[PDB]
Amino acid sequence: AYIAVPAVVDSRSSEAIGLLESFGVDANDVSYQDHDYVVDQLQYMLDGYEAGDVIDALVYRNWLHHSVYCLLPPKSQLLEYWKSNPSVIPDNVDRRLRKRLMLKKDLRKDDEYNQLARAFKISDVYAPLISSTTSPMTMIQNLNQGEIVYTTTDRVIGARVLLYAPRKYYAPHSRFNVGTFPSIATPKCSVMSGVDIESIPNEFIKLFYQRVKSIHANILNDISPQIVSDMINRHVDVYRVDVVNVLFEVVDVADGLRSVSRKLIMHTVPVCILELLGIEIADYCIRQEDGMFTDWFLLLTMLSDGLTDRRTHCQYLINPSSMPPDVILNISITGFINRHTIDVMPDVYDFIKPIGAVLPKGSFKSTIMRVLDSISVLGVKIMPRAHVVDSDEVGEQMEPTFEHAVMEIYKGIAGVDSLDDLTKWVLNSDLVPHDDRLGQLFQAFLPLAKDLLAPMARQFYDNSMSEGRLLTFAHADSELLNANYFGHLLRLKIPYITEVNLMIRKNREGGELFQLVLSYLYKMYATSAQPKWFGSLLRLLICPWLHMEKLIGEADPASTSAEIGWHVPREQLMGFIPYVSIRAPRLVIEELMEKNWGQYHAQVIVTDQLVVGEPRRVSAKAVIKGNHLPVKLISRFACFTLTSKYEMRLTGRGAAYNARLAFRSD
């Protein structure tokens, strides 16, 4: 039997990981195929052919019939190799040509030898010949017919690639076999699908599955992970996160009995967080005694990448307020359907920089900061009430604040004499912005945000970046861009409706309607780019550490602990300033040790009175001049911290020292 799954299945790594426990199947008996080479071959052939044709041919290919390719050299070379080593010449070739190849003193002067030479073509000598022009279908068919298929071009799809001649001339069937490419060739070939084509990330398996479902929907033996388990029965890679979806419906519990209003889907909640929170398939109440959320529903919502409903399929938004129209207070969970893996490490991260995140005005910034502060797994703090710059903190330290500056904007606008009058004039009875009036008001708002804010914002951002690596929160994309922020730029959105959250909040230095209009102004001020969900950043920040707790939480602390930081030489009359901290198994850090933390120079200015603290520690300021630390240079098997402040480990005055990185441990 053959089973296809949406993944990348190898022999050794896939056997170790299994991926059946990862997809939910309870698995010797199963034999694992290898397909990284065929994924690479797909990528290589996708140039000179068409994706649809290649997919059709490859799905017509079957995987239980072992075969192999064999590239012959070009004609001149083939004749040459045969001439040099002539024992190999095949019998099939004609007597005259083979006899003249079995001779010395051969050269270009020979007449009849050349006659045979360009009268010779490889049609008879090697029978199934994939030439350059062969269609994808024929090549696949041939592999199924015979064990060996001869080819002239490297660009092939199939089993393997072998060289017929030396290099210089070119210029396990168990009961159930799993794989990652469905085949319709056998009448019964089973493809398992509990996960939808919407969420698989490889994009190559995604295209393959989409095309095969589009053209062969009625003839695919589709099954489920549970029936797969029923049929079968009778270094640790970090950032490999298993995720599921939650099918839950909101219930408006009256005095009498149950009443189900809407059915909802939460897309990519991680399994580990559900395990720690210990949610069960039953009903729940999501509200505090005060009237806000219980922070575990809040954590789950902030940890997801989407929240839609079932009857329709548009993006749904939670109502933070308790107002009638779409109030939500009770939740009943009714099972999880799909489950797969995901690489929580974003492609944007690259090498290490300060991280900047963009959130709307009516976000949950205070609550999420409070929740993230009280997070610890190992003997470290992930993101305390530090290393974080609030969005209002960029403009709070001015004699008129930016909020006060934009309060005094009704002057110079006809028909308005006060802030309340301005709010009445710009907002209609519907509390929906009037396009013309708000567009007019933006023409007065923007010059202040481009002349009164931007220089101070640039100076503050540069100063903050100088004295440590910090995560910075901002309201608009243009706010960070116009200040020349030197760091990773992330755009984030929350499922909840921010406007009602602004409407319920009070005492935000002015009228609530002013807050609504100001939030609209920052929203339109931002550029046009698709914001990713907050779930990506939150998962990146939290999830990898829990796996480290699972693995080395039992292990010795000092053996596992390690850190990197700047190393000022001892002979500097008046030291270690940590940069990142890595918690990893002993083998990982031993691998880390010999990596050269050189050619990473920085200028350190460390002069201050003691930062009030548990240990005697003065604060430093380091600026990186060369490159930055690549994360793959550090590891993928070891976690670390995203943000850290700069402070020197020890009095006197200060000076500038050109230091380098160093890796110290116990």
């Binding site: 059709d56 017509y60 589009s214 009625n218 009498g256 929906v432 406007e499 409407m503």
Partner: protein, 1061 residues
């Protein structure tokens, strides 16, 4: 006021309509037309097929003083088919106890009546409904139609044969029991085999089981045509639903007549390949297989019309199609470059180096080959298949700038290139352009008369696109005098006599595929040039064909022009000799493309045509005869005002379709002048090797299955629309009692959008379906295409509408709902509000006939259109005016339209609630249809309904009304005391069809509403005389009947038809 403001804001945020306007239009239409998503037709159901499950309401009182606990079967943990409870109801839950491969993403799930169900009726058009509770009663008909649509649409599955096992217990008598997959599987036998349970007790369930018949259990018929193989089909007695069985049987019947065995697949593929590719099918007995692909011609024509409407006056949707066909031609066409013929036949022309002008160097620079010429040539050649939507005109840049001059060598060579290139186009006005490209460049030197002074002799030759801009001097050759104009006369003669003639190739097979072509007979393909098949497989050069004749005649025409006595003396002698040599050597070029076009091109085009994702769409080719020149090919998608007949509403309610496509002459001329074959080829072997990989695919077979659904959907849409609108089609309407609004033109569009969304969601489609029709008004829709000639003679094609099993099953479900509205959750009739204080235990859903009254009851004041309230004075009773002008007090029996109370809720509440609570009046509110809730109260305690009825009356709104609450007593199985009960809302008709059994596991029901297990349902069991297959469908569902389970396999076409490479 801030609460109202935030409520309005949240409502305006949440009231967004779920509609997607077409923004990325060109790419989406092109992608769909080049490749269409295929619906999942066959799906397999492994669990028992049913839709009505029995749910308990009140827990059973198995501990009690009157009777010991050693009596009930629940004390012995005896599993029973029916729930043992004081009150049992039956509700609707589509696809419960099912194990399907693919879920249809639709489900009609009903909560028990003790819970609210207004969320399934406030879905469709209840955008303005503010409160979470309640729905607008004016869209109940649309909501019910959508609910039944989802019911039918997710009940479409095929039953599976799973397995059996001999019974090892004396319960049955050697019966066969079916097992179904699942983790907790032993809980299904007691449910699906009611007669297997023993009868030790005298409970109602035991009495019914004893009254049933013993010998109807499990399998009783088998189809085992083979040893060691699955039985093809079996018949089993199991708990099921008659409506579900009928729907799935109809679906299987629809699928069965699309089935084809590999014999005609072999035949059709061989006839498509014309023997070039041979395929083999096995000759032996077999496991029955199911491969539904054969379709009728009406569906094919309808889908072709849909595609034509999709490709409307765009000129960019069709370009990728022609490019793809050009690539397909290039892959298998033996003709190739030969990049040296043009230079080799010009390097040997004898000239004089003293002369400044050189014809060979001029032509070699004017006719530069770059082998994009072959791509352009193949695009032009593939454009032959689509002349009803595409007119492959020639590009304007090919024509000489301003006007040419015969005294100019470059202009003369440009005229030669244009003359060779023009005949290969599909433009109807190609001959007149060919005449005028020469008539333009020699004005003043040589003159001919014209029709008008606007379209004079010196207009651009490309500006003659209209069929009736052809000059009369060109239509009648005699106008051109042979003395004043000796050259244009000969050119007109050549154009009239040696222009190529049309022909046809007769592609395709109609046995498996349909006949998509229209305006033409089935099984034919028209060509602009004549085609004589070759009788040899070793081709060799010959000059006896139309294209070579045309090239030659052009050569002698230019030779005569050069040799003319009024033109030669202007040239020197050496240049005249060199040009004569050039023309004579270019006439005898060894180009083989003309013979390729004559012999092999039509054959391979006929090979390509069947498995093409856009089938050929052609109109007749006519040469030089401007009476049958086709103009205004048009399509319609709706009638206009009152004409219900498409033959009369078509000629003036159509939309023109067609675009011009531009190609350059320098490419086509190079391709037509340069080309060979491989140095030693044989046509049969070459074509076999080239086109064997082409026929392995099953894409056209997939588009046939897509064609099925794209025609099912339109009929379903019109049938559904015709029951909420007024259409021209004859439809049978059943749900006229459910209240509904007067739908506008936008309500129908919204309903149609919801219908197509549900259809595509269930059938798993990701591209546009039925959407092109939605751009027009959906109330009146019809499909028809037409085209007319120049002389006004018009022809029209109106495909007949085939039956649609989806709409048939929807109509069947509506008919069943007409009698069984209670199970889906619906009340029929109207409510009556008034005090009823007593110690009786009658259910409000089955009230005694004394309390109710109607319009014909004497002494009843019927209100309505007009009503005014006059306040009382000095103790006088307040009075409300009657509908007949009378004035009556607040006492008696009234009749209210529900619209009146909706319009005056607050006034009527404040004026009438006190009198209803304490006075004597009783109001009958005519409602038509309404959802209900059920609250069960303990009969031994004082219970009041005033709170419930007030909390229902205070939310009646000009928009929405909540569900009607009822109080139903609990049926006790032992004598109890009596306490007063006060009820306010009672139904009008017997509205208690949903009840199943009261006090099941108990010897009798003493107090309260009683009902034994319905004997009329289990008719097959209780009635010995009824045959097993007999069902009474429109009235009841019988909850039990015979169902046939299949085991047909669905293999790929390739795995059964190999192809013998």
């Amino acid at each position: 006021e801030i609460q109202r403001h935030i409520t309005e804001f949240i409502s305006s945020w949440q009231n967004h309509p779920i509609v997607q306007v077409s923004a990325d239009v060109e790419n989406r239409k092109t992608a769909q037309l080049l490749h269409a998503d295929t619906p999942r037709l066959v799906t397999w159901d492994a669990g028992l097929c049913t839709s009505f499950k029995i749910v308990p309401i009140v827990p059973a009182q198995v501990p009690q003083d009157v009777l010991a606990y050693t009596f009930f079967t629940s004390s012995y943990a005896i599993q029973s088919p029916f729930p043992e409870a004081a009150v049992s109801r039956i509700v609707v839950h589509t696809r419960w106890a099912s194990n399907v491969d693919f879920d249809r993403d639709s489900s009609v799930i009903m909560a028990p009546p003790t819970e609210n169900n207004i969320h399934l009726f406030k879905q469709l058009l209840n955008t303005e409904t503010l409160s979470v509770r309640g729905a607008n009663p004016l869209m109940f008909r649309a909501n019910v139609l959508h609910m039944l649509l989802e019911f039918v649409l997710d009940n479409l599955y095929l039953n599976r044969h799973t397995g059996f096992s001999q019974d090892h217990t004396p319960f049955t008598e050697g019966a066969n029991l079916r097992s179904l997959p699942g983790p907790d599987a032993e809980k299904w036998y007691s449910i699906m085999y009611p007669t297997r349970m023993g009868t030790p007790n005298v409970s109602k369930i035991c009495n019914f089981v004893a009254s049933c018949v013993r010998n109807r259990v499990g399998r009783f018929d088998r189809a085992q045509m083979m040893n060691g193989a699955m039985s093809e089909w079996v018949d089993v007695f199991e708990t099921s639903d008659a409506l579900t069985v009928s729907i799935r049987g109809r679906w299987m019947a629809r699928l069965a007549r699309m089935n084809i065995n590999p014999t005609e697949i072999e035949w059709a593929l061989t006839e498509c390949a014309q023997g070039y590719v041979t395929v083999t099918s096995p000759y032996a007995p077999s496991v029955n297989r199911l491969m539904p692909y054969r379709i009728s011609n009406a569906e094919r024509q309808i889908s072709q019309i849909i595609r034509v409407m999709n490709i409307g006056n765009n000129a960019t949707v069709i370009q990728p199609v022609l490019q793809d066909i050009s690539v397909l031609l290039q892959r298998i066409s033996p003709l190739q470059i030969d990049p040296t013929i043009i230079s080799n036949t010009m390097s040997t022309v004898s000239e004089s180096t003293t002369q400044t002008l050189s014809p060979a160097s001029s032509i070699l620079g004017k006719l530069r080959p770059s082998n994009s010429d072959f791509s352009s040539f193949r695009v032009a050649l593939a454009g032959w298949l689509y002349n009803g939507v595409v007119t492959t005109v020639i590009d304007d840049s090919s024509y000489p700038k301003d006007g040419g001059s015969v005294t100019s060598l470059e202009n003369l060579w440009d005229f030669f290139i244009l003359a060779l290139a023009l005949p290969l186009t599909t433009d109807p006005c190609a001959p007149v352009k060919a005449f005028m490209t020469l008539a333009n460049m020699m004005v003043g030197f040589e003159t001919i008369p014209m029709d008008n002074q606007i379209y004079t002799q010196s207009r651009r030759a490309s500006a003659f696109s209209t069929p009736h801009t052809w000059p009369r001097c060109f239509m009648n050759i005699q106008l051109i005098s042979p003395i004043d104009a000796p050259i244009l006369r000969q050119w007109a003669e050549i154009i009239h006599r040696y222009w190529p003639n049309p022909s046809q190739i007769r592609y395709g097979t109609p046995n498996v595929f349909g006949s998509a072509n229209l305006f033409t007979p089935p099984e034919v393909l028209l060509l602009p040039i004549d085609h004589q098949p070759a009788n040899v497989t070793t081709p060799t050069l010959d000059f006896t064909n139309e294209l070579t004749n045309w090239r030659a005649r052009v050569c002698e025409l230019m030779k005569n022009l050069v040799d003319n006595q009024r033109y030669q003396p202007g040239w020197t002698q050496s240049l005249v000799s060199s040009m004569r040599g050039t023309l004579g050597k270019l006439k005898l070029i060894k180009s083989m493309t003309p013979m390729y076009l004559q012999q092999l091109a039509p054959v391979e085009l006929a090979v390509i045509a069947p498995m093409l994702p856009f089938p050929p769409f052609q109109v007749p080719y006519v040469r030089l005869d401007r009476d049958r020149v086709p103009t205004m090919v048009g399509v319609t998608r709706q009638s206009r005002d009152t004409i219900t007949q498409p033959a009369l509403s078509l000629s003036t309610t159509n939309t023109t379709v067609g675009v011009p496509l531009a190609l350059d002459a320098r490419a086509i001329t190079v391709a037509l002048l340069s080309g060979k074959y491989p140095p030693d080829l044989v046509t049969n072997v070459w074509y076999a090797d080239a086109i064997y990989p082409m026929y392995a695919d099953t894409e056209v077979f997939s588009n046939l299955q897509r064609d099925v659904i794209t025609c099912e959907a339109v009929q379903t849409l019109v049938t559904l629309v015709a029951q909420i609108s007024e259409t021209q089609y004859p439809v049978d309407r059943y749900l006229d009692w459910i209240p509904s609004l007067r739908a506008s033109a936008a309500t129908a569009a919204t309903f149609a959008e919801w219908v197509n969304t549900s259809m595509k969601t269930a059938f798993d489609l990701s591209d546009m379906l039925l959407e092109p029709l939605l751009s027009g008004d959906p109330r009146m829709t019809q499909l028809a295409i037409q085209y007319q000639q120049y002389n006004g003679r018009t022809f029209n094609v109106i495909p007949e509408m085939p039956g649609s099993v989806i709409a048939d099953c929807v109509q069947l479900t509506a008919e069943v709902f007409n009698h069984e509205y209670n199970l889906f959750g619906i009340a029929r009739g109207d409510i009556i509000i008034g005090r009823v204080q007593s110690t009786h235990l009658w259910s409000p859903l089955a009230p005694p006939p004394d309390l109710v009254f109607d319009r014909d009851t004497p002494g009843v004041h019927i209100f309505g259109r007009d009503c005014r309230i006059s306040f009382g004075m000095n103790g006088a009773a307040p009075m409300i005016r009657d509908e007949t002008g009378m004035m009556v007090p607040f006492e008696g029996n009234w009749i209210f339209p529900l619209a009146l109370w909706q319009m005056n809720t607050r006034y009527f509440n404040q004026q009438f609630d006190a009198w209803i609570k304490t006075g004597e009046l009783r109001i009958r509110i005519e409602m038509g249809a309404y959802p209900y809730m059920l609250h069960y109260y303990d009969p031994r305690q004082y219970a009041n309904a005033w709170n419930l009825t007030s909390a229902w009356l205070e939310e009646i709104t000009p928009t929405s009304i909540p569900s009607v609450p009822f109080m139903v007593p609990i049926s006790s199985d032992h004598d109890i005391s009596s306490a007063p009960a006060v009820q306010y809302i009672i139904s009008t008709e017997y509205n208690d069809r949903s009840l199943f059994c009261t006090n099941s596991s108990s010897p009798q029901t003493i107090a309260g509403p009683d009902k034994h297990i319905p004997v009329e349902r289990y008719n097959i069991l209780t009635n010995p005389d009824a045959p097993p297959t007999q069902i009474q469908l429109p009235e009841v569902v019988d909850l039990y009947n015979v169902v046939t389970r299949y085991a047909y396999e669905t293999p790929p076409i390739t795995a059964v038809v190999m192809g013998v490479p």
